[PDB]
Amino acid sequence: PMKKIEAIVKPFKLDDVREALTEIGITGMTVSEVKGFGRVDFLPKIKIELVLADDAVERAIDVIVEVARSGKIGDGKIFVLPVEEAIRIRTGERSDAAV
Amino acid sequence: PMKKIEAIVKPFKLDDVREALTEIGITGMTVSEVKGFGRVDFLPKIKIELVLADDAVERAIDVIVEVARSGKIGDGKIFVLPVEEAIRIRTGERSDAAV
Amino acid sequence: PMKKIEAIVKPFKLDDVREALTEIGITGMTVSEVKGFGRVDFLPKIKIELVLADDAVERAIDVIVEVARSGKIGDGKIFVLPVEEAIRIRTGERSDAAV
């Protein structure tokens, strides 16, 4: 079973998050630029997206929180959604970031 | 239990949607620029994303439809997806737009 | 029951994918620009998003793989996620790409 992780964090935290995940065996991710409103009325943020095996989700979340948590407003948000199919277009094999 | 709302609407409807949601206690959202094809062959749209408590979803949908529904083609689309985890990076508490 | 398809493919494959889906009755889609890391450390990609009836998912996936599969690294990824509500803002009717 696969899951999707969506992480909304400050733009300048990309490198740190990437290397932290790479250290635990997770490398394939998608990144997009978005505007964050809530806590002009908005600030630029980046949305990091990855799809991986359910058993790898907990460690991935912990590592993201570790590099992004500072204790004050705006540290970001992490969402986990169910994925019914994860396909690697090349072979039809499963697309797992945790491989 | 949390849910995710994805709303695809015309770019110039952002302000109206934001204030309408703020009026019912929903403020934290993410916004991204996308191209909409379907009904050049595309028009710029904005994708509004929010994660909130399941009990707040119905009212949120109704308010979005209220400000965006005009009766003619292109009013937009609203999708609801299940969320298994909603985490506020700062404390590990739940990330609820409806608070 | 509705489902969401997220397809991450090379930027120059948009036209081919669009026409292939149009040939099988699927037209409404959203497209966004993202950065893909994994297999500078990234390359521009496009994320194609569509929400359609569960019975239309298999054929849609097959057609996307058909036009994008080349046999070598970077062909892309396809994810399927559950959708609890798909609403056409205009009438409140269901938003189905497969109509």
What are chain A's domains?
1-99 (3.30.70.120)
Strand, helix or coil for residue B67: helix
**Which residue is associated with the tokens 């056409």?**
C88
CA distances to A34, B44, C14, C33, C45 from B17, rounded to whole Å, are: 17, 17, 30, 24, 29
Question: How many Å apart are CA C80 and CA A56, to the nearest integer?
Answer: 19
Burial C9-33 (b: 16+ CB within 10 A, else e): bbeebbeebbebbeeeebbbbbbbe
Burial of B69 (0-12, 13-18, 19+ CB in 10 A): middle
Strand, helix or coil for residue C54: helix
**Which residues in chain B have Cβ-Cβ distances shorter than 8 Å to A42?**
31
- Residue C83, min C-alpha distance to chain A (Å): 10
Rounded to the nearest 5°, which phi and psi values hold at B14?
-50, -55
Question: How many Å apart are CA A29 and CA A78, to the nearest integer?
Answer: 14
The distance from CA A61 to its chain's CA centroid, rounded to whole angstroms, is 8
Sequence-distant (6+) residues with CB within 8 A of B62 are none
Largest CA distance in chain C: 47
Residue by residue, DSSP assigns chain A as -EEEEEEEE-GGGHHHHHHHHHHTT---EEEEEEEEE----EEEEEEEEEEEEGGGHHHHHHHHHHHH--SSTT--EEEEEEESEEEETTTS-B--TT-
Would you say C14 and B24 are in contact if contact means Cβ atoms under 8 Å apart? no
Token digits for C82? 């559950």
Q: Inter-chain contact C89–B75, Cβ cutoff 8 Å?
A: yes
Would you say B52 and B97 are in contact if contact means Cβ atoms under 8 Å apart? yes
* Contacts across the B-C interface (CB distance below 8 Å): 78
Would you say B67 and B76 are in contact if contact means Cβ atoms under 8 Å apart? no
Strand, helix or coil for residue B55: helix
Find the closest chain C residue to A18 by CA distance: C37
Would you say B6 and B83 are in contact if contact means Cβ atoms under 8 Å apart? no
Question: How many Å apart are CA B11 and CA B9, to the nearest integer?
Answer: 6
Would you say B78 and B5 are in contact if contact means Cβ atoms under 8 Å apart? yes
∠ CA C21-C26-C27, nearest 5°, is: 95
